[PDB]
Amino acid sequence: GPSFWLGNETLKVPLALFALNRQRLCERLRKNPAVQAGSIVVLQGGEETQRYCTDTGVLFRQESFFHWAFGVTEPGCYGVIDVDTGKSTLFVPRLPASHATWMGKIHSKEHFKEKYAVDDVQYVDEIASVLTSQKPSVLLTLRGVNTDSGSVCREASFDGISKFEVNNTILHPEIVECRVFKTDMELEVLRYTNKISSEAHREVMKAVKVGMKEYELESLFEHYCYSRGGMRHSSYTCICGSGENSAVLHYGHAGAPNDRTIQNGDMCLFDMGGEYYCFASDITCSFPANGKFTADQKAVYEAVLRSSRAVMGAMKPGVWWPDMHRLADRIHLEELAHMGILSGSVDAMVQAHLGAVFMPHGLGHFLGIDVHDVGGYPEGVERIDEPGLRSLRTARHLQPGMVLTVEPGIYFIDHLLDEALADPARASFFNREVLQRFRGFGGVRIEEDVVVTDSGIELLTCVPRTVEEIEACMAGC
Amino acid sequence: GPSFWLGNETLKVPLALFALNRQRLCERLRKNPAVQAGSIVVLQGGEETQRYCTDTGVLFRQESFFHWAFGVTEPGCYGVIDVDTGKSTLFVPRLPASHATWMGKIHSKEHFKEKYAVDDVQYVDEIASVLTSQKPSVLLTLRGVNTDSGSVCREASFDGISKFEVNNTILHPEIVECRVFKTDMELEVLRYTNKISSEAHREVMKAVKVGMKEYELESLFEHYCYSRGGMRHSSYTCICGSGENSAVLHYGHAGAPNDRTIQNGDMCLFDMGGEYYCFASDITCSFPANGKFTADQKAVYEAVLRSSRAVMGAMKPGVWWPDMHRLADRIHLEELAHMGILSGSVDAMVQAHLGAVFMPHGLGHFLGIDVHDVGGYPEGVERIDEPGLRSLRTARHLQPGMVLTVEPGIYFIDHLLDEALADPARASFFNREVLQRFRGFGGVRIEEDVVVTDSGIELLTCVPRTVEEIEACMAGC
Ligand SMILES: O=P([O-])([O-])O
Ligand SMILES: O=P([O-])([O-])O
Ligand SMILES: O=P([O-])([O-])O
Ligand SMILES: [Mn+2]
Ligand SMILES: [Mn+2]
Ligand SMILES: [Mn+2]
Ligand SMILES: [Mn+2]
């Protein structure tokens, strides 16, 4: 059996992985009472892209659904799967012999059959003819709404498609459910992205110096992942927040691109995750820039370590994800009170929604081929209309084989804080004189990637977490 | 006067650079008799994009024309220039006061006026009424054909733009012609991009070892450029061909993603250039993987070194660029004859277009904000319909201020070789028994970036070039 491999110490991923996904999608559609006999799944791969109107090629990364079904790295492909038999056909672009002048050897269709271990390979321009000869009942295409972006997924289309019966509602929720439940072969890849990203995080912690620019660490992190782990891409733009910037969720975008000089006294919050063969990792480490936690940083950090461990210790099949988020809120509030920042009844603090002031984002989300993976809110799973909870990327109950991030945080965000101090239903909880000490603290977030097993979780991530472990990693070790 | 800067040893670029561009564009438009008084240039900035239908951010890189004119790093902006007066107005998006949580500091309009040194800043939702009160005769927008991609530039559009008179033919030829001639400020940025990429090429040469994967060198090059040079993007996808892949012109892309193991005996061809503040560099180095040229490798290498130095020596205002391409072709053929690969009259070889068998691409191209920069083929300049020369990205005569790549090379491409050996008008020049030993040699390209001065050229790139220099570099002398 063939495998994708970037050599050295990188992971061998069997193409069988994708055969299993195809097989699981078919099994799921045969069980579907409204999937007609003789149906055929028709997916379209992503295409080569350029910067606006220039000839500057953009690096091609495969469309995620298409990758999940076939594992194909080349642009311009299509893929069909006969539902009743499970037979797979890949369609590759016809490159004219003259292209060998600027390409290498132009690969034969047979080269692609053995590469991807699919049942047949044909040219893209013969798609209409090839599907005609199969006399299918219906073409199942991919159309639906991603619940993190709001975008509608592009449906496959080819010249001549109008002569076929096309159903575009059935496939989306089904191919999404398959993706939510990771196979053992998929887990092996997620273990590997986490291992490599964990090593990269360790290296950053070793190298950080007061005086460096944040992007120096971004650069180091991507160099390790690529050179040591074959990860050409990151799963998302690196967030390298130091000082006040640790309080900016999604910092490091074009408008704030990791350009701050790290200073003595700053907390660093680093959320960086490499991507191997279109599989994600998503890992955040928080640590003092100088290698020594102050009392205040120890206190806030250990509050987050506490919610992290309490959530992970409680996760198991049947657990409603929003319950864990509320747990994290409660623990934050408890500890924020133990440290003297808040006073009064934790119950009262909860009933007021104070938790959302300190952790305005969701506790965690599905992870897979996308960092924010599909299937958090299928039909019938409602968004909870409350501050904090409304940002959860899923409201599902945990089941074995799900892959989630566990990412609690405590931040000191000036405009959430000024709001609470202006709301008489929230103001009384604050001790202004101690709060003043934490203005500009930034934030801590501790983000693990876990798998939901039959009875608990498997922790994918391996970074130092306790105060002791972190101060030791930063000093060598 | 304010400047773009990324700290450390990174280059300070004065925002005055872009004011000069706006000034120069206006002066050229004023001379154009089709341009009506009261005309306003309206450019639209690039927007934030995501991976297909997911919420995975793609790192924002500004549209080229817009950057040339304003140097704005933020997504979602417009920018207008009053032709008669030269006053610039930047339009920035109105971000709801309520998501400082996720963005950070919502910057006021004065911040941006200060930041970019424009005459005025307003919100984007106000663009129709801001323009309406200026009572323009005509809006000049940007539409044209890029002569490398064949793509049509996206013309600026906003809500209520159909109430204006809009012209979309005048601007493109004029803004392109300004981009062709680099100001002293632009040149300073280009010296820097070349300095940094040259330093990185030197590091890639000291680091190359047999048994490494090509992408390890790509990763290091990029890491030097980012951590050491502030270059978050490269100018194009790194080409790291070794062995037979050094003969593959479009190498490095998704379908051949630098995944070959560097072998003893291989030639390497590394084409890589970092990008700083959307300014490009374009450098190719060629060298033996093991750090030592064989006789065959030296002969071919010194053939390309010869034509590189000949072309650079010849360049001056007034020189027709296709004559330089021809001069490279003649030098290659001379050397390939001295080597025994060819026999007979070099004049006859030239008449038969045999040079394009060994160098199928153009000698070089304008370089600027884009690596294949705009303006090689404006009205009245035609593509020469002959092998090799048809691939030239410009057929213009050289003038002070133009920046070009000089990138001759020799490759052994089976498709081209086989075609030529079947043609009795070309076959006779080959010594097949000598040609044999060079099959699967790969190729060598030597690529320098230069500026045309009043009297000749200025060389920007600073890498090892002679056989002695390269071997001494690789041995870690
Ligand atoms: O970014 P995130 O990971 O979702 O928090
Ligand atoms: O799982 P669920 O919760 O039923 O969605
Ligand atoms: O890529 P290139 O440099 O244009 O050849
Ligand atoms: Mn994260
Ligand atoms: Mn996450
Ligand atoms: Mn190049
Ligand atoms: Mn070039």
From Swiss-Prot, chains A, B:
The modification Phosphoserine is found at residue 162. Its EC number is 3.4.13.9. Pfam families: AMP_N, Peptidase_M24. Mn(2+) 2 binds at residues 282, 365, 407, 447. Its cofactor is Mn(2+). Binds 2 manganese ions per subunit. GO terms for biological process: amino acid metabolic process; collagen catabolic process; negative regulation of programmed cell death; proteolysis. Mn(2+) 1 binds at residues 271, 282, 447. Keywords: Acetylation, Collagen degradation, Dipeptidase, Disease variant, Hydrolase, Manganese, Metal-binding, Metalloprotease, Phosphoprotein, Protease. Specifically inhibited by the pseudodipeptide CQ31. Inhibition by CQ31 indirectly activates the CARD8 inflammasome: dipeptide accumulation following PEPD inactivation weaky inhibit dipeptidyl peptidases DDP8 and DPP9, relieving DPP8- and/or DPP9-mediated inhibition of CARD8. A dipeptide binds at residues 250, 282, 372, 393. GO terms for cellular component: extracellular exosome. It catalyses: Xaa-L-Pro dipeptide + H2O = an L-alpha-amino acid + L-proline. Homodimer. Dipeptidase that catalyzes the hydrolysis of dipeptides with a prolyl (Xaa-Pro) or hydroxyprolyl residue in the C-terminal position. The preferred dipeptide substrate is Gly-Pro, but other Xaa-Pro dipeptides, such as Ala-Pro, Met-Pro, Phe-Pro, Val-Pro and Leu-Pro, can be cleaved. Plays an important role in collagen metabolism because the high level of iminoacids in collagen. This is Xaa-Pro dipeptidase. It comes from Homo sapiens (Human). The lineage of its organism: Eukaryota, Metazoa, Chordata, Craniata, Vertebrata.
